[PDB]
Description:
Radius of gyration of chain B: 7 Å
CATH superfamily of chain A: RNA Cap, Translation Initiation Factor Eif4e
Family (chain A): Belongs to the eukaryotic initiation factor 4E family.
Strand content of chain A: 25-35%
Structural class of chain B: mainly alpha
Bound molecules: 7N-methyl-8-hydroguanosine-5'-triphosphate
Order of helices and strands of chain B: H
Strand order of the largest sheet of chain A: 2-1-3-5-6-4-7-8
CATH topology of chain A: RNA Cap, Translation Initiation Factor Eif4e
Strand content of chain B: under 5%
Largest sheet of chain B: none
Pfam family, one (chain A): IF4E
Structural class of chain A: alpha+beta
Number of domains of chain A: 1
Number of helices of chain B: 1
GO cellular component, one term (chain A): eukaryotic translation initiation factor 4F complex
Radius of gyration of chain A: 16 Å
Order of helices and strands of chain A: EEHEEHEEHEHE
CATH architecture of chain A: 2-Layer Sandwich
Number of strands of chain A: 8
Oligomer: heterodimer
Keywords (chain A): Acetylation, Autism, Autism spectrum disorder, Chromosomal rearrangement, Cytoplasm, Host-virus interaction, Initiation factor, mRNA transport, Nucleus, Phosphoprotein, Protein biosynthesis, RNA-binding, Translation regulation, Transport
Subcellular location (chain A): Cytoplasm, P-body; Cytoplasm; Cytoplasm, Stress granule; Nucleus
Largest sheet of chain A: 8 strands, antiparallel
Helix content of chain B: 55-70%
Amino acid sequence: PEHYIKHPLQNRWALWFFKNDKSKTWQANLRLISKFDTVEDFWALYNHIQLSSNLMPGCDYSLFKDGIEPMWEDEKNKRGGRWLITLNKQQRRSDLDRFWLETLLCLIGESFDDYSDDVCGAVVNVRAKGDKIAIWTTECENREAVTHIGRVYKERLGLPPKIVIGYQSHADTATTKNRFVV
Amino acid sequence: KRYSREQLLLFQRL
Ligand SMILES: CN1CN([C@@H]2O[C@H](COP(=O)(O)OP(=O)(O)OP(=O)(O)O)[C@@H](O)[C@H]2O)c2nc(N)[nH]c(=O)c21
């Protein structure tokens, strides 16, 4: 219970926003919002922006490590993939916001041990057809890392053993099969 | 530098 020091995070993080505008190219619709590197600065940003459940369909938030843009094209994403949590419309009210926050805490908390280095970031897609949350990792052939991340993330989300989540390569998503499953 | 869920959530409250 400290009195004046802030609590530094392992990494500096950038929050990005995406606004659906079909008259533009996909990457022109990405806006960098803010960056932070302490627990206090995280909460101050979180408390000052809308819950994902209140965004317009077509919008995203992404939290990525500083220097990694939330796009396949980035050098740290092009060889990577994502652990995908899919939700229907009717779970928006009940699950979206608490899953998304849990995902933020796994990122900024460095909850995957050594393998947190493989984490690039996370994305929440709010969509009329069904929302998605995912953790993007740097290298889909780092089997030990990808598998430990997904096992721990499913546990942290608190999902039943009989709901199975999948890991997709971005190369496959661009052109989806799963490389791993948990 | 690592923080558990509970240590992170504590600062939201404090
Ligand atoms: C993450 N994306 C998404 N994207 C474009 O946006 C489209 C939809 O991607 P999404 O927003 O991730 O998913 P969603 O809106 O649910 O559509 P879908 O259900 O087809 O996946 C893709 O088909 C792609 O053309 C991208 N285009 C580029 N160049 N780089 C990227 O990193 C991404």
